[PDB]
Amino acid sequence: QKALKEVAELRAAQEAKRTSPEVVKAVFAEAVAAQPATPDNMSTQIINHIPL
Amino acid sequence: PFKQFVEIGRVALINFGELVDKLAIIVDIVDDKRVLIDVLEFDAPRQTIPIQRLKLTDYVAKIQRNAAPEAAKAAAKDFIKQFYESAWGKQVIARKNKAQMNDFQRFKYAQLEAKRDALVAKEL
Amino acid sequence: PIVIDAKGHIQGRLAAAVAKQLLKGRKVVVVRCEEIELNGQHKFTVHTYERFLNKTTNSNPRDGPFHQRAPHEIFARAVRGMIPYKTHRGADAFANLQCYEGIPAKYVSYKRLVIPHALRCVSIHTDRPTTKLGRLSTTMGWKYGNVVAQLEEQRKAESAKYFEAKKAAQDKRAAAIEKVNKQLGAQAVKFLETFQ
Amino acid sequence: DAENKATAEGAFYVPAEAKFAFVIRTKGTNKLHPDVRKILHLFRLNQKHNAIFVRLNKATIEMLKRVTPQVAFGYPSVDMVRKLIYKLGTANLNGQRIPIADNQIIKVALGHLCIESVEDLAHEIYTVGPNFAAANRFLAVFKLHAPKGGYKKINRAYVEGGDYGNREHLIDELIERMI
Amino acid sequence: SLKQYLVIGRPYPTKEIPNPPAVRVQVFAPDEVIAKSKFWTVAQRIARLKKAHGEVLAVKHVIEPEPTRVKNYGVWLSYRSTRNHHNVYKEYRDTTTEGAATKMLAELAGTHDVSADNISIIKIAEVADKDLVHKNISQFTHENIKFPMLKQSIRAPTASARKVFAATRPTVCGF
Amino acid sequence: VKLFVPATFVSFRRSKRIIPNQALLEIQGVVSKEEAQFYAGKKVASVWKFDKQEFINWGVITQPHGNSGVVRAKFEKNLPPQMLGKQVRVMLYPSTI
Amino acid sequence: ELLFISPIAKKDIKRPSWRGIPRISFTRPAVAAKAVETRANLKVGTVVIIVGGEHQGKRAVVVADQGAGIVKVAGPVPVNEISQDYLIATSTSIDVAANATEAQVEAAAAKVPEMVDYLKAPFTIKKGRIHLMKF
RNA sequence: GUGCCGAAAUGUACUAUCACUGAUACCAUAAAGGGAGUCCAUGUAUAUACUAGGGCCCCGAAAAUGAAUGGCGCAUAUAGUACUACCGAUCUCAG
């Protein structure tokens, strides 16, 4: 019960790092970087009729 | 004609949920069904709320959209005074005072009401 | 013994509320059974009832289900479905009910409760059509619909003369209560109104 | 600190995988394939709401792939492995299903294997030391009651909004309320 | 409820190629265990990486920089209905990316009647008021928005104080 | 033994189809799960007259049932079906508050 | 005691021990709770509602606390002994040091305005809720 | 499973729906083919014209005793989606 108080503190001390303003904006910048480029056109088939 | 619209900077008495019975101002709109709201008595975090669990009053603060906390609280200082002074807002305090009433005080209220009803019955 | 002003209400919503509190063991009048209002257009409500008229026993109509056209026994039938009426507890419970088209001379004096979640405002949307029970019954042949309206007019005149007297009592009661606030005190008035 | 070192460097600390598991039988006996109840008889999970600790290797994991619809299982933390054995722990001695009571029970069975008292037995589970299967066989199967939230859907997996199969760390959330 | 997650995974080292390319997937799931399984679905389907030979390195939980204020969210998705696949760009107004994604799973299941099994999102991102092109959401970015609350609720202010009678009749008017 | 809060005997505990060891009572003025937790523990008493011999039946409250404030309740002689509808007395001891 | 429990050296085969664990004899040689506390928030001289037995709806002041969960009541209409089962603690607390003395309770309550009228008054239940009644 | 019959939220949050109509696996039937009904929507051209389509709803849809979403009835008790509380077997657990 002394040890499980210490382990409760150390696991809670990680949540201070996780929810810090410095660390969260880095993770959100990684998530914004991860997403793909914007598609110009939707629809199943583009259809191209170039001569020859 | 509807008088009282949902608007940026309007005071509202939230009827439903964990924040029931507490005045709060609508700092930003989001949707048809929902609003961002700032609670002024309690000091919770501001958060999204449905408008249907909200209900409204006449009074309106001059504020910008997504106002700062405490800055928007200064705008509401006139209207919370006008709310609790008005007779619709007296029933908010009466429910609250009655709710916290304790044993002995309920005997005091019963005895003063007997003295009230005795002296009224004379004048007929 | 409760009385229920059933104007504004929905038929099934009221009947579900009423049938539950009969089984809890409580006597319950409803009144103004004709101004209960169903969902649907007048076309649609009639076609529902015309299907119900077809349902007869073929060997002979006399043993057939009876088709009550009065609003006070259309509503009573809708309640009878929701109670186990063939058992002794249900038949005792169903005997405690009362419906009246137009509030009669007995129950004018009683205080009239209005069960709020069965009101047609709360349960139907805006911009969808509804019809009364009286309108439907007259169409289905009820012959006393006209008579009830005449009676309502006579009553609601006499109900108005009650309120003009009851204003005059309660106004001079407030002027009497204006005096007694000074006799108790300044701080005693706060304790009655606000609660300290 | 090994995690927070790698983030400051650049890298990822991937953790060590789970050395053992804890396998509740969720569904009962009947309407069941004979291969898939041979496999449950090998884990000694015959009745509904029974559980033991099972060591994880490619033998036992591939057995658990066959029986995934019948069981909920995951990787319990040390506080959960403790709290099972102190409360509900029993020793299956000479096929008798005896309650654990006192440490002189488990000294007599397991003292030659250097496991003296109930702290040493619980340790031999969660570290998965060399005499694990002695210590696991010594424990009778646990017998749990159906939990005080209920749970949503027997017949779907946890991964698709249900119950059965692997739930990794969140078995601890289940066992708290089973106890 | 759904929480945005970033998951990075890789294949095991062969002796032919130690240190391969890892790959990341944005996924939306209630907890860390489900987020792994959504990663292995997308990794297998596209980049040809199976559960049975691959690590998974870091389940990062994306929390918002600020949930204090409202943002617009474009959501490019495909959804599949029997006999055809449709591509749709839909957008929403919400406090966070997750609450926008939770909205559209309800809206597609409502409007089009397709489940989250059939749906496959391409791109979520926050979007400015200038680049926003849909009319019903553009109205909330303007100033001087009034709408009334026509149709009030009748609920209990607290669940203790509910009742099934009333003397007076409730008024459900907006006012 | 006067002083009680009125409470109807609304039903036996039952499934859909099957129902007498325990009973359900709707205590007057109680409408919530957290509201009805106060009356957990407390002692009910049924009473009835035989002409000139007024008997009493106890009567206890175990747990709340559902979200309507209905509460479960044993009696020492479990109730007859003729009581369905009628009142009983929920006396408010033993009160730890 | 659970000492003298020893493992059998037999290896009979009728009964087999699968792992290292061996069958246990479980034999000895032939030769041969609860505190029930007093309840907190019942001090010396708290005003209390009596709801059980002989007195119902009658308020009383606790002259002194006997201990073991039983307290002896005093007041106008007095001196009885009953457990915390039959008592409800009000917030109000009249200052009385002394044990029993029925005369001192009315004398002490004469200090506090209309507390003597409060104590002699019955407590009763009406139309329109004890759970919500904050005491 | 939780309007009432019927034990248990007409629960909270979010989208569709007006039709003599719809309503929970096995299951107690409905298709090809249509619709400036309504909601959502793809690509182009100049607020407007031209359509890639998708749901829900309508038409297509006729049998003999009077007739059955189980009934009453409902129209936010209909069609989907998400999250908690709750009732419920001779299973499970405790004695």
TrEMBL record, chain A:
Coiled coil: none annotated. Transmembrane segments: none annotated. Belongs to the universal ribosomal protein uL4 family. This is Large ribosomal subunit protein uL4. It comes from Trichomonas vaginalis (strain ATCC PRA-98 / G3). The chain holds residues 319 to 370 of 370 of the full protein.
Automatic annotation (TrEMBL), chain B:
This is Ribosomal protein L14, putative. One of its GO terms (biological process) is translation. One of its GO terms (cellular component) is cytosolic large ribosomal subunit. It comes from the Eukaryota. Residues 45-116 form the Large ribosomal subunit protein eL14 domain. Keywords: Ribonucleoprotein, Ribosomal protein. Coiled coil: none annotated. Belongs to the eukaryotic ribosomal protein eL14 family. GO terms for molecular function: RNA binding; structural constituent of ribosome. Gene3D superfamilies: 2.30.30.30. The keyword Ribonucleoprotein applies. InterPro entries: Rib_uL2_dom2, Ribosomal_eL14, Ribosomal_eL14_dom, Translation_prot_SH3-like_sf. It comes from Trichomonas vaginalis (strain ATCC PRA-98 / G3).
UniProtKB/TrEMBL annotation, chain C:
Keywords: Ribonucleoprotein, Ribosomal protein. GO terms for molecular function: mRNA binding; structural constituent of ribosome. It holds the Pfam family Ribosomal_L13. GO terms for cellular component: cytosolic large ribosomal subunit; ribosome. The keyword Endoplasmic reticulum does not apply. Disulfide bonds join 33-99. It comes from the Eukaryota. GO terms for biological process: negative regulation of translation; translation. InterPro entries: Ribosomal_uL13, Ribosomal_uL13_euk/arc, Ribosomal_uL13_sf. Belongs to the universal ribosomal protein uL13 family. This is Ribosomal protein L13, putative. It comes from Trichomonas vaginalis (strain ATCC PRA-98 / G3). The lineage of its organism: Eukaryota, Metamonada, Parabasalia, Trichomonadida, Trichomonadidae.
Automatic annotation (TrEMBL), chain G:
Gene3D superfamilies: 2.30.30.30. It comes from the Eukaryota. GO terms for molecular function: RNA binding; structural constituent of ribosome. The keyword Cytoplasm does not apply. One of its GO terms (cellular component) is cytosolic large ribosomal subunit. GO terms for biological process: cytoplasmic translation. This is 60S ribosomal protein L6, putative. It comes from Trichomonas vaginalis (strain ATCC PRA-98 / G3).
